[PDB]
Amino acid sequence: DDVKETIKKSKTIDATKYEMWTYVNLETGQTETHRDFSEWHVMKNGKLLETIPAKGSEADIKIKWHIAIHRFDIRTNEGEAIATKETEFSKVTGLPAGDYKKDVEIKDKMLVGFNMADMMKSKFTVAGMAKVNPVLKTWIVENPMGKAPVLSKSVFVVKFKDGSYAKIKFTDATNDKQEKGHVSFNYEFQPK
């Protein structure tokens, strides 16, 4: 009558587009996809050349949400994370103590527009500002160009702004045709 039931589910997110974030509610399973909200910056010959106006805002997101995914970049909604040494959820007892890390801001670094014709002209587009979690980024050990990504086997724990938390184990970074950016994970979420 006073501890809410744990929500144990799997999800598959299409994060293939450089332009987009997918916002994920782990309590309800709802998702929403929106174009990145920053001012975009075209880099040409190693310097900031052109701007593309900022469009929309996070107020356009209707659902509550916990994590968001852009390609293999993972952020939280003002949350914090650790990578445990465990490989199985049953070995992570409760909310572990540890050195939890909040999301960081990265300037003119996250790709929002990328193709080979422009790359050969030394041109590509980045988010003016973006938020990414430096612990969750480690879910990928290696991502060699043209080749299979290598995933961490660690269980992550993420603490959310309402006091909830989840154990998360990532299982796939490609679909069954080996297309990169289809991100799958299992999780166990404790509601408050």
Residue numbers in the entry: 5 to 196
Original authors' sentences:
P. gingivalis is a heme auxotroph, therefore it must acquire this compound to survive and cause efficient infection establishment. Amongst well-characterized heme acquisition systems of P. gingivalis is that encoded by the hmu operon, comprising HmuR, a typical TonB-dependent receptor involved in heme transport across the outer membrane, HmuY, a heme-binding protein, and four proteins with unknown function. The work presented here substantially extends our knowledge of P. gingivalis HmuY by presenting data on further structural characterization of this protein and novel data on a second member of P. gingivalis HmuY-like family, Tfo produced by T. forsythia. The comparative analyses of HmuY homologs suggest that not only the HmuY hemophore-like protein of P. gingivalis, but also T. forsythia Tfo may be engaged in heme acquisition.
Similar to apo-HmuY, apo-Tfo exhibited topology typical of all-β strand structure, with the main distinction apparent in the fold forming the heme-binding pocket, where two long β-strands in HmuY that form one side of the pocket are replaced in Tfo by four shorter β-strands. As compared with apo-HmuY, analysis of the 3D structure of apo-Tfo confirmed differences revealed by spectroscopic analyses, mainly in the fold forming the heme-binding pocket and the lack of two His residues coordinating heme in HmuY. Tfo lacks the two His residues that are required for axial ligation of the heme in HmuY. Instead, Met, Lys, and Tyr residues are potentially available for binding the heme. Based on spectroscopic studies, we assumed that two methionine residues are the best candidates. Although the apo-Tfo structure exhibited a ‘closed’ form, partly caused by malonate binding, MD showed that it could open up to accommodate the heme. Comparison of apo-HmuY with apo-Tfo showed the same kind of opening of this region and it is the ‘same’ loop, containing Met149 (Met169 according to the numbering of amino acid residues in the full length protein) that moves significantly compared with the crystal structure of the closed conformation of apo-Tfo. Importantly, they demonstrated that heme can be bound to Tfo efficiently under reducing conditions, which favors coordination through Met residues. Moreover, reduced conditions influence properties of iron coordination to methionine more significantly than to histidine, thus allowing efficient heme binding also to Tfo and heme sequestration from the albumin-Fe(II)heme complex by Tfo. This effect could be explained by bis-Met heme ligation in Tfo, which results in stabilization of the reduced state as compared with bis-His ligation in HmuY. However, to date we do not have structure of the holo-Tfo, as 1.8 Å data collected from brown holo-Tfo crystals only reveal presence of the apo-form of the protein.
